[PDB]
Amino acid sequence: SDQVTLLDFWPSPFGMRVRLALAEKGVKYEYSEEDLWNKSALLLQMNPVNKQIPVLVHNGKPVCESLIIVQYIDEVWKDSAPLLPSDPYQRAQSRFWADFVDKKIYDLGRKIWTKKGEEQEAAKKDFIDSLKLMEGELGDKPYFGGETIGYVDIALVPFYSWFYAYETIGNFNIEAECPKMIAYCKRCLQKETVSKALEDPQKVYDFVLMLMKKFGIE
Amino acid sequence: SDQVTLLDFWPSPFGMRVRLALAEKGVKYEYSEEDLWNKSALLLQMNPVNKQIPVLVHNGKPVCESLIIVQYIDEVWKDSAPLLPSDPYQRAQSRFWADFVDKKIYDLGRKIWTKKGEEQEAAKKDFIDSLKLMEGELGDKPYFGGETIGYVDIALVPFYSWFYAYETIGNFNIEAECPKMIAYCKRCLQKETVSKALEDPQKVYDFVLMLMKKFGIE
Numbered sequence: 232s233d234q235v236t237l238l239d240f241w242p243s244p245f246g247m248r249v250r251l252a253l254a255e256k257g258v259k260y261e262y263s264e265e266d267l268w269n270k271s272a273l274l275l276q277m278n279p280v281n282k283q284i285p286v287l288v289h290n291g292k293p294v295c296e297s298l299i300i301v302q303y304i305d306e307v308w309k310d311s312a313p314l315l316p317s318d319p320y321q322r323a324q325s326r327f328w329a330d331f332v333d334k335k336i337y338d339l340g341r342k343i344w345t346k347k348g349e350e351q352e353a354a355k356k357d358f359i360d361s362l363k364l365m366e367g368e369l370g371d372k373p374y375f376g377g378e379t380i381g382y383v384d385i386a387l388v389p390f391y392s393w394f395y396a397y398e399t400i401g402n403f404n405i406e407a408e409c410p411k412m413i414a415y416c417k418r419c420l421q422k423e424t425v426s427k428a429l430e431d432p433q434k435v436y437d438f439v440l441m442l443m444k445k446f447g448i449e
Numbered sequence: 450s451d452q453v454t455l456l457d458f459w460p461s462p463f464g465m466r467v468r469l470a471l472a473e474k475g476v477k478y479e480y481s482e483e484d485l486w487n488k489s490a491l492l493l494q495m496n497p498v499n500k501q502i503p504v505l506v507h508n509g510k511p512v513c514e515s516l517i518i519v520q521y522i523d524e525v526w527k528d529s530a531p532l533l534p535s536d537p538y539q540r541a542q543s544r545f546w547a548d549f550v551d552k553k554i555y556d557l558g559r560k561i562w563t564k565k566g567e568e569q570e571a572a573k574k575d576f577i578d579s580l581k582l583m584e585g586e587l588g589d590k591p592y593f594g595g596e597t598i599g600y601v602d603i604a605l606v607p608f609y610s611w612f613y614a615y616e617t618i619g620n621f622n623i624e625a626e627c628p629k630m631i632a633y634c635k636r637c638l639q640k641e642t643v644s645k646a647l648e649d650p651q652k653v654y655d656f657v658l659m660l661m662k663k664f665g666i667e
């Protein structure tokens with residue numbers, strides 16, 4: 232009747248974003264695993280600008296970038312509640328915080344396990360401040376999108392999959408500094424859509440241990 | 450009535466995006482120059498999270514981040530031509546190439562004037578290649594938005610006023626490689642809304658000379 236395809240790689244938090252969006256909005260689709268070393272002809276022709284995953288393919292037209300995909304899902308499949316607020320203002324706030332996750336959480340998270348020594352130390356410090364800022368925005372609400380899970384939650388919660396990696400490689404403990412965030416991420420894991428879309432934390436960690444060796448930054 | 454204020458820094462291309470979107474949508478507002486290394490109390494109140502300009506303040510409420518502000522304007526002031534395409538699939542593409550500027554153009558741009566030797570030149574190569582990808586998507590249309598100036602145009606064209614500075618400190622010539630891009634940039638400047646919002650290229654260059662000295666880097 233139209234069909235959709237998601238080109239993804241199991242441990243990508245960016246890909247889990249789109250997996251969760253599609254779940255929440257009830258969209259049926261086939262999932263196509265990729266090899267980041269052996270990129271498919273489909274991948275190259277669908278995202279010829281970045282040759283990266285995820286890519287949502289809708290009736291033969293591609294959409295690139297996890298966050299933009301989510302928004303597209305949200306604007307095209309409207310049988311379920313919107314994931315972004317309808318109010319211009321709040322929506323602007325969601326975009327900011329969903330974006331905050333890319334610019335801060337991912338960027339600093341990646342430095343924790345790629346960098347070393349004092350630099351790695353710096354990366355851990357900013358990482359925690361960033362989570363705390365997000366903790367502020369969450370306040371007392373059950374989700375970032377209020378009583379319902381919404382855009383920002385979809386942006387944020389896939390990264391729990393990578394928390395164990397960070398902590399272990401970076402030698403710090405998140406829950407210690409951010410009890411409220413961890414509690415949030417667990418309250419989310421109990422949603423079936425969330426637990427399914429996410430991947431196993433120690434499976435993720437092994438995969439990073441492997442990655443570190445193939446680049447020599449052990 | 451509505452009180453609109455733009456906290457901004459005059460040579461910022463990110464704020465120029467906003468000056469332009471405001472002008473293009475016919476929006477009356479007040480400007481307030483912000484210090485770069487001395488946050489006003491106002492800036493600190495409106496953007497405690499990043500403490501960066503541009504911030505738009507609409508009827509007391511703040512909106513952070515260039516692109517998101519611009520989306521906010523498109524959605525709030527609807528009595529002029531929409532900056533973002535109506536069709537979701539095309540909306541996604543605007544979102545993509547506007548984002549693309551943030552990630553490749555600015556990132557590689559900044560590296561050109563802040564870096565030396567092999568790293569500087571490496572940026573210029575990547576810089577050109579990204580412009581050439583943007584050329585490929587411009588096609589033969591007057592604007593990225595087609596016949597009418599659009600969201601991607603507003604995201605990209607503020608950077609032309611920095612081009613002379615890139616070209617001069619990096620010691621290369623953009624037109625030699627991307628003459629189409631230059632042709633378009635030049636074409637854009639004829640639109641008066643664009644010539645009022647953009648600042649003088651030589652005056653920007655003076656200001657980049659200004660940073661390179663402040664931090665000893667020439």
Ligand SMILES: N[C@@H](CCC(=O)N[C@@H](CS)C(=O)NCC(=O)O)C(=O)O
Nearest residue numbers: 243245267282283284285296297298
């Ligand atoms: N900025 C992209 C992230 C895409 C990304 O980084 N994905 C990686 C794997 S998780 C990829 O596609 N790999 C391409 C490569 O490594 O060259 C988004 O948020 O959509």
Ligand SMILES: N[C@@H](CCC(=O)N[C@@H](CS)C(=O)NCC(=O)O)C(=O)O
Nearest residue numbers: 461462463500501502503514515516
């Ligand atoms: N990501 C922001 C860019 C903000 C930005 O980088 N602006 C700079 C000046 S152009 C700034 O506010 N600098 C202040 C600081 O570094 O503290 C956007 O898209 O608007």
